[PDB]
Design a protein around this ligand. Structure first.
Ligand code: ADP
Ligand code: MG
Ligand code: MG
Length: 200
Protein backbone atom coordinates (compact mmCIF):
# COMPACT_ATOMS: atom_id res chain seq x y z
CA UNK A 1 0.00 0.00 0.00
CA UNK A 2 0.85 3.68 -0.36
CA UNK A 3 1.99 5.59 2.72
CA UNK A 4 0.53 9.02 1.86
CA UNK A 5 2.99 10.72 4.22
CA UNK A 6 6.17 8.82 3.29
CA UNK A 7 8.42 8.41 0.25
CA UNK A 8 9.71 5.03 -0.85
CA UNK A 9 13.17 4.59 -2.34
CA UNK A 10 11.95 5.37 -5.87
CA UNK A 11 10.21 8.54 -4.70
CA UNK A 12 13.32 9.69 -2.83
CA UNK A 13 15.37 9.33 -6.02
CA UNK A 14 12.71 11.19 -8.03
CA UNK A 15 12.68 14.01 -5.46
CA UNK A 16 16.36 14.78 -6.07
CA UNK A 17 15.91 14.44 -9.84
CA UNK A 18 13.01 16.90 -9.59
CA UNK A 19 15.03 19.28 -7.40
CA UNK A 20 17.89 19.17 -9.92
CA UNK A 21 15.60 20.11 -12.82
CA UNK A 22 14.14 22.85 -10.60
CA UNK A 23 17.56 24.28 -9.66
CA UNK A 24 18.71 25.27 -13.17
CA UNK A 25 16.41 28.32 -13.48
CA UNK A 26 18.15 29.93 -10.49
CA UNK A 27 21.80 29.33 -11.49
CA UNK A 28 22.46 32.75 -13.04
CA UNK A 29 21.03 34.54 -10.00
CA UNK A 30 23.17 32.51 -7.58
CA UNK A 31 26.31 33.28 -9.60
CA UNK A 32 25.65 37.03 -9.41
CA UNK A 33 25.18 36.94 -5.61
CA UNK A 34 28.59 35.31 -5.07
CA UNK A 35 30.80 37.67 -3.05
CA UNK A 36 32.21 35.30 -0.38
CA UNK A 37 34.91 34.22 -0.03
CA UNK A 38 35.71 35.70 -3.46
CA UNK A 39 33.37 37.36 -5.99
CA UNK A 40 34.02 35.06 -8.95
CA UNK A 41 30.38 34.47 -9.91
CA UNK A 42 30.23 30.67 -9.87
CA UNK A 43 28.19 29.53 -6.83
CA UNK A 44 25.17 28.53 -8.92
CA UNK A 45 27.25 26.69 -11.51
CA UNK A 46 29.24 24.89 -8.79
CA UNK A 47 26.14 23.74 -6.90
CA UNK A 48 24.33 22.62 -10.07
CA UNK A 49 27.26 20.48 -11.26
CA UNK A 50 27.22 18.85 -7.82
CA UNK A 51 23.50 18.06 -8.12
CA UNK A 52 23.78 16.86 -11.73
CA UNK A 53 26.48 14.32 -10.81
CA UNK A 54 24.26 12.99 -8.02
CA UNK A 55 21.46 12.54 -10.57
CA UNK A 56 23.71 10.75 -13.08
CA UNK A 57 24.72 8.31 -10.33
CA UNK A 58 21.10 7.74 -9.26
CA UNK A 59 20.18 6.90 -12.86
CA UNK A 60 22.80 4.11 -12.80
CA UNK A 61 21.70 2.70 -9.42
CA UNK A 62 18.96 0.29 -8.34
CA UNK A 63 16.64 2.94 -6.91
CA UNK A 64 14.29 0.24 -5.59
CA UNK A 65 16.58 -0.10 -2.54
CA UNK A 66 16.95 2.82 -0.12
CA UNK A 67 20.58 1.96 0.65
CA UNK A 68 21.43 2.20 -3.05
CA UNK A 69 19.68 5.57 -3.36
CA UNK A 70 21.71 6.85 -0.41
CA UNK A 71 24.95 5.47 -1.87
CA UNK A 72 24.38 7.12 -5.25
CA UNK A 73 23.50 10.45 -3.60
CA UNK A 74 26.69 10.59 -1.52
CA UNK A 75 29.06 9.10 -4.10
CA UNK A 76 27.80 11.11 -7.07
CA UNK A 77 27.76 14.43 -5.21
CA UNK A 78 31.36 13.99 -4.03
CA UNK A 79 32.73 13.36 -7.54
CA UNK A 80 30.76 16.24 -9.07
CA UNK A 81 31.42 18.69 -6.24
CA UNK A 82 32.97 21.94 -7.48
CA UNK A 83 34.13 24.90 -5.40
CA UNK A 84 33.45 25.53 -1.73
CA UNK A 85 29.67 25.36 -2.16
CA UNK A 86 29.84 22.07 -4.07
CA UNK A 87 32.11 20.39 -1.52
CA UNK A 88 29.93 21.55 1.38
CA UNK A 89 26.73 20.52 -0.43
CA UNK A 90 28.17 17.07 -1.18
CA UNK A 91 28.94 16.58 2.52
CA UNK A 92 25.48 17.81 3.51
CA UNK A 93 24.07 15.20 1.13
CA UNK A 94 26.37 12.58 2.68
CA UNK A 95 24.85 13.20 6.11
CA UNK A 96 21.39 13.15 4.53
CA UNK A 97 22.21 9.79 2.93
CA UNK A 98 23.53 8.51 6.28
CA UNK A 99 20.10 9.05 7.84
CA UNK A 100 18.52 7.07 5.00
CA UNK A 101 20.83 4.08 5.50
CA UNK A 102 19.00 1.26 7.27
CA UNK A 103 15.55 2.76 6.64
CA UNK A 104 12.83 1.66 4.24
CA UNK A 105 10.85 4.89 3.79
CA UNK A 106 11.32 8.61 4.36
CA UNK A 107 8.54 10.05 6.51
CA UNK A 108 8.32 13.43 8.20
CA UNK A 109 10.23 12.24 11.27
CA UNK A 110 13.13 10.83 9.24
CA UNK A 111 13.25 13.97 7.07
CA UNK A 112 13.85 16.07 10.20
CA UNK A 113 16.67 13.73 11.21
CA UNK A 114 18.06 13.74 7.66
CA UNK A 115 18.11 17.55 7.46
CA UNK A 116 19.73 17.79 10.90
CA UNK A 117 22.37 15.15 10.15
CA UNK A 118 23.05 16.78 6.79
CA UNK A 119 23.77 20.14 8.42
CA UNK A 120 26.09 18.61 11.03
CA UNK A 121 27.99 16.63 8.38
CA UNK A 122 28.47 19.80 6.34
CA UNK A 123 29.69 21.65 9.43
CA UNK A 124 32.21 18.95 10.37
CA UNK A 125 33.50 18.86 6.78
CA UNK A 126 34.62 22.50 6.69
CA UNK A 127 38.02 23.00 8.31
CA UNK A 128 37.14 26.48 9.66
CA UNK A 129 33.38 27.09 9.43
CA UNK A 130 32.05 30.64 9.11
CA UNK A 131 28.54 31.76 10.07
CA UNK A 132 26.14 33.67 7.85
CA UNK A 133 26.60 30.99 5.20
CA UNK A 134 25.16 27.76 3.77
CA UNK A 135 26.08 26.17 7.11
CA UNK A 136 23.89 28.62 9.04
CA UNK A 137 20.99 28.16 6.60
CA UNK A 138 21.25 24.35 6.56
CA UNK A 139 21.33 24.21 10.36
CA UNK A 140 18.24 26.43 10.72
CA UNK A 141 16.35 24.23 8.25
CA UNK A 142 16.97 21.11 10.33
CA UNK A 143 16.28 22.87 13.63
CA UNK A 144 13.05 24.38 12.30
CA UNK A 145 11.67 21.26 10.59
CA UNK A 146 8.51 20.39 12.53
CA UNK A 147 5.57 18.06 12.01
CA UNK A 148 4.80 14.45 11.13
CA UNK A 149 3.70 14.75 7.49
CA UNK A 150 6.37 15.35 4.84
CA UNK A 151 4.66 18.48 3.52
CA UNK A 152 4.54 20.21 6.91
CA UNK A 153 8.16 19.24 7.61
CA UNK A 154 9.34 20.65 4.28
CA UNK A 155 7.22 23.78 4.72
CA UNK A 156 8.56 24.55 8.20
CA UNK A 157 12.14 23.67 7.22
CA UNK A 158 11.92 25.96 4.19
CA UNK A 159 10.47 28.84 6.23
CA UNK A 160 13.25 28.54 8.82
CA UNK A 161 15.85 28.42 6.04
CA UNK A 162 14.46 31.53 4.33
CA UNK A 163 14.44 33.35 7.68
CA UNK A 164 18.09 32.46 8.36
CA UNK A 165 19.02 33.45 4.79
CA UNK A 166 17.65 36.97 5.28
CA UNK A 167 19.85 37.29 8.40
CA UNK A 168 23.12 36.30 6.70
CA UNK A 169 24.27 39.93 6.05
CA UNK A 170 23.75 40.63 9.76
CA UNK A 171 26.46 38.06 10.56
CA UNK A 172 28.91 38.43 7.64
CA UNK A 173 30.06 42.02 6.93
CA UNK A 174 31.18 41.32 3.34
CA UNK A 175 27.55 40.46 2.55
CA UNK A 176 26.25 43.64 4.20
CA UNK A 177 28.78 45.81 2.37
CA UNK A 178 27.76 44.28 -0.97
CA UNK A 179 24.04 44.36 -0.14
CA UNK A 180 23.42 40.65 -0.81
CA UNK A 181 22.48 37.52 1.10
CA UNK A 182 24.80 34.51 1.04
CA UNK A 183 24.88 32.80 -2.36
CA UNK A 184 25.54 29.35 -0.92
CA UNK A 185 22.70 29.62 1.58
CA UNK A 186 20.41 30.90 -1.17
CA UNK A 187 21.27 27.82 -3.23
CA UNK A 188 20.21 25.60 -0.33
CA UNK A 189 16.89 27.46 -0.15
CA UNK A 190 16.34 26.77 -3.85
CA UNK A 191 17.10 23.09 -3.22
CA UNK A 192 14.52 22.89 -0.41
CA UNK A 193 12.07 24.79 -2.63
CA UNK A 194 12.44 22.12 -5.31
CA UNK A 195 11.84 19.35 -2.77
CA UNK A 196 8.65 21.07 -1.60
CA UNK A 197 7.54 21.33 -5.23
CA UNK A 198 7.93 17.58 -5.68
CA UNK A 199 5.94 16.83 -2.52
CA UNK A 200 3.16 19.31 -3.36
N1 ADP B 1 34.44 28.58 5.68
C1 ADP B 1 33.16 28.50 5.25
N2 ADP B 1 32.15 28.24 6.12
C2 ADP B 1 30.87 28.17 5.71
N3 ADP B 1 30.48 28.33 4.44
C3 ADP B 1 31.39 28.60 3.47
C4 ADP B 1 32.81 28.70 3.83
N4 ADP B 1 33.47 28.97 2.69
C5 ADP B 1 32.56 29.03 1.69
N5 ADP B 1 31.31 28.81 2.15
C6 ADP B 1 30.07 28.81 1.35
O1 ADP B 1 30.37 28.69 -0.05
C7 ADP B 1 29.76 29.76 -0.77
C8 ADP B 1 30.62 30.16 -1.96
O2 ADP B 1 30.58 29.08 -2.89
P1 ADP B 1 31.55 29.02 -4.17
O3 ADP B 1 31.42 30.31 -4.94
O4 ADP B 1 31.26 27.72 -4.88
O5 ADP B 1 33.02 28.87 -3.53
P2 ADP B 1 34.38 29.30 -4.28
O6 ADP B 1 34.95 30.40 -3.42
O7 ADP B 1 35.18 28.02 -4.29
O8 ADP B 1 33.94 29.75 -5.65
C9 ADP B 1 29.55 30.88 0.23
O9 ADP B 1 28.38 31.65 -0.07
C10 ADP B 1 29.39 30.15 1.54
O10 ADP B 1 28.00 29.94 1.80
MG1 MG C 1 32.71 31.39 -6.08
MG1 MG D 1 35.50 29.70 -7.59
Amino acid sequence: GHMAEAWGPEAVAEAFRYATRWFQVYVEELNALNVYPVPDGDTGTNMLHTLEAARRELDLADTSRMDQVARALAYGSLLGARGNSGVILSQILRGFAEALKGKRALDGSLLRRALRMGAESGYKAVMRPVEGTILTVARAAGEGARGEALEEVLETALEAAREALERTPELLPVLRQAGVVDAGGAGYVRLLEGMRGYAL
